[PDB]
Amino acid sequence: ADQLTEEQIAEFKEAFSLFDKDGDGTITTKELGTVMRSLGQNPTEAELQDMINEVDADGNGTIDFPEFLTMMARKMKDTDSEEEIREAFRVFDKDGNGYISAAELRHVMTNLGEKLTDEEVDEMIREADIDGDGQVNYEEFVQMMTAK
Ligand SMILES: [Ca+2]
Ligand SMILES: [Ca+2]
Ligand SMILES: [Ca+2]
Ligand SMILES: [Ca+2]
């Protein structure tokens, strides 16, 4: 939390929900793998376990919200962060026009079993929509995933 802006924190609150499949309040190594693979990533089992252990501050084997924020902050500094962020953007920009629309955001959420509401989709876009065109372009997506 001490490394992120209030907007990033807001976005990640929703992202935490995407990773928490069963919705038990914590993210497991398995859930992390499934969701990351769905978001254009391809981490090995050892890399997933390291990701968890590195920010699992209370050593309970799972990741809660505060620990998740730490994971996201560190992720933004990965040596291959640019590539990872590009691959994630690709997953959202289904029609490849360079913009993530509300329809495309709803599609990713629904594919991830995440129930949604228009108000929720509007807020997610609003938090990253710098030029205010109602969509999230690559530059805006990168900014949201940039450590400040
Ligand atoms: Ca869970
Ligand atoms: Ca933990
Ligand atoms: Ca698009
Ligand atoms: Ca925009």
From Swiss-Prot:
It holds the Pfam family EF-hand_7. It is found in: Cytoplasm; Cytoplasm, Cytoskeleton, Spindle; Cytoplasm, Cytoskeleton, Spindle pole. Belongs to the calmodulin family. This protein has four functional calcium-binding sites. Residues 7-42, 43-78, 80-115, 116-148 form the EF-hand domain. PANTHER family: CALMODULIN LIKE 3, MYOSIN LIGHT CHAIN 1, 3. Keywords: Acetylation, Calcium, Cytoplasm, Cytoskeleton, Isopeptide bond, Metal-binding, Methylation, Phosphoprotein, Repeat, Ubl conjugation. There is a cross-link at residue 21 (Glycyl lysine isopeptide (Lys-Gly) (interchain with G-Cter in ubiquitin)). There is a cross-link at residue 21 (Glycyl lysine isopeptide (Lys-Gly) (interchain with G-Cter in SUMO2)). The modification Phosphotyrosine is found at residues 99, 138. Calmodulin acts as part of a calcium signal transduction pathway by mediating the control of a large number of enzymes, ion channels, aquaporins and other proteins through calcium-binding. Calcium-binding is required for the activation of calmodulin. Among the enzymes to be stimulated by the calmodulin-calcium complex are a number of protein kinases, such as myosin light-chain kinases and calmodulin-dependent protein kinase type II (CaMK2), and phosphatases. GO terms for cellular component: centrosome; cytoplasm; cytosol; myelin sheath; protein-containing complex; spindle pole. Ca(2+) 3 binds at residues 93, 95, 97, 99, 104. Homotetramer. Interacts with CEP97, CCP110, TTN/titin and SRY. Interacts with MYO5A and RRAD. Interacts with USP6; the interaction is calcium dependent. Interacts with CDK5RAP2. Interacts with SCN5A. Interacts with RYR1 and RYR2. Interacts with FCHO1. Interacts with MIP in a 1:2 stoichiometry; the interaction with the cytoplasmic domains from two MIP subunits promotes MIP water channel closure. Interacts with ORAI1; this may play a role in the regulation of ORAI1-mediated calcium transport. Interacts with SYT7. Interacts with MYO10 and MYO1C. The modification N6-methyllysine is found at residue 115. The modification Phosphoserine is found at residues 81, 101. Ca(2+) 2 binds at residues 56, 58, 60, 62, 67. The gene is CALM. GO terms for biological process: regulation of release of sequestered calcium ion into cytosol by sarcoplasmic reticulum. GO terms for molecular function: calcium ion binding; protein domain specific binding. It comes from Bos taurus (Bovine). The N-terminal and C-terminal lobes of CALM bind to the C-terminus of KCNQ1 in a clamp-like conformation. Binding of CALM C-terminus to KCNQ1 is calcium-independent but is essential for assembly of the structure. Binding of CALM N-terminus to KCNQ1 is calcium-dependent and regulates electrophysiological activity of the channel. The C-lobe interacts with KCNN4 channels in a calcium-independent manner, whereas the N-lobe interacts with the S4-S5 linker of KCNN4 in a calcium-dependent manner playing a role as calcium sensor and gating the channel. The modification Phosphothreonine is found at residues 44, 110. Ubiquitination results in a strongly decreased activity. Phosphorylation results in a decreased activity. This is Calmodulin.
